[PDB]
Structure 1
Amino acid sequence: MQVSVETTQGLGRRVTITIAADSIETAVKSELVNVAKKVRIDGFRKGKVPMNIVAQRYGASVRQDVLGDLMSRNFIDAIIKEKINPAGAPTYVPGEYKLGEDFTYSVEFEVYPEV
C-alpha cells in the first residue's frame, strides 16, 4: 500500500493514503458479484446478469457504485501499513475518485493516553 502519516496537533493525527487500482477492482469483480450472487437475491437465472443489453444504465450504477466501492477498500489496508492506534468513532474524509485510477482519503481520530 501507499501511505503518508502526518502527526501532531494536540494528539490529533491525519493519515493521507493512495489506493491502488487493481486491488479494489477485485472487490468490484469478486466481492460485489459474490455477496450479491448467493445469500438470497431475486430472479436471476444462471450467472447473475452480465452488463449486456439492458443498457449501461446499470452501468452508471456499476461505474458509480464502483466509484463508491473503489473509494472504501485500501484506506483500511493503508492505515495498517504505516501502523497507528484507535480510539472512538473514526471520521472518513473522502478525496476525488477517478475511475480505474488511484484513490486518496483520510482519518482523523484520537488515541488513548499512554506514558
Structure 2
Amino acid sequence: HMQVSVETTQGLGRRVTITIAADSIETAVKSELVNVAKKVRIDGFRKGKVPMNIVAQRYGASVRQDVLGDLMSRNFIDAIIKEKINPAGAPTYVPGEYKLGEDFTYSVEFEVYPEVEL
C-alpha cells in the first residue's frame, strides 16, 4: 500500500502524485531524531544522552524537513519501479503544503522515454 496516482499530461509528459501517511512520517522523524541525538553533547552529560524533548525542540523542524525530502524521493523511486515508469532526465518535485502531524501529498513531473525505435 502507498497511495499513488499516475497521470498523462501532454506528449511524453507524466505526473505522479503521492500521499505519505502521517504515521510513516512520524516514524521516520523519530528514528532520525534518535540518530541526531547520538551526535549532540551538552555539558551536563556525556555525548548521546540528551533528552529527546530537547533534541526534538531544537532539531525537530530541520529533521522533519530532511525526512519529508527523503520520503518524497524514496517513494517516487519505489513508485516508478512498481508502475514501470521510465523517466527521462531529471524529474521535478512539486511539493504540496505540509501540515504538522498530517498526511502529506506531492507530485513529481517528468517526461518518459519514447519507445526505442530501430
Task: Identify the TM-score tier after normalising by the shorter chain.
Answer: 0.5 to 0.7
- Tell me how far 1:33 sits from its aligned partner: 2.7
Most deviating of 68-77 and 88-97: 68-77
Residues 76 and 96 of structure 1: CA distance in aligned 2, closer, same or farther (over 3 Å): farther
In structure 2, relative to structure 1, the CA distance for the partners of 1:88 and 1:46 (3 Å cut) is: same
Residue 82 of structure 1: how far off its partner (Å): 3.5
Q: Which runs of 5+ in 1 are unaligned?
A: none
Most deviating of 96-105 and 39-48:
39-48
Give the match's secondary structure for 1:92: strand
After TM superposition, the score normalised by the length of structure 1 is 0.67
Deviation per CA, 1:42-62, whole angstroms, max 9, x where unpaired? Answer: 997253532546994655556
Alpha-carbon distance in structure 2 between the residues aligned to 1:15 and 1:58: 30
Higher relative contact order (Cα pairs below 8 Å, separated by 6+ residues): 1
Contact 2:38 2:47 in 1 (8 A): no
Residue in structure 2 matched with residue 90 of structure 1 by the alignment: 91
CA deviation map 1:61-100 (0-9, x unaligned): 5666667667665444444444421221111101011122
Distance 1:15 1:2 in 2: 10
Q: Which moved more, 1:72-81 or 1:8-17?
A: 72-81
Cα-to-partner distance string for 1:4-58 (whole Å, 9 max, x where unaligned): 1111411001111111112222220113432662699999725353254699465
Q: Which runs of 5 or more residues in structure 2 are unaligned?
A: none
Percent pairwise identity: 100
Q: Which has the higher strand share?
A: 2
Paired residue secondary structure (1:84): coil
Q: Which moved more, 1:42-51 or 1:5-14?
A: 42-51
Query: For the aligned residues, what is the CA RMSD?
Result: 4.1
Higher helix share: 2
Matched length = 115
- Residues 56 and 37 (structure 1), Cα distance of their counterparts in 2 relative to 1, 3 Å cut: closer
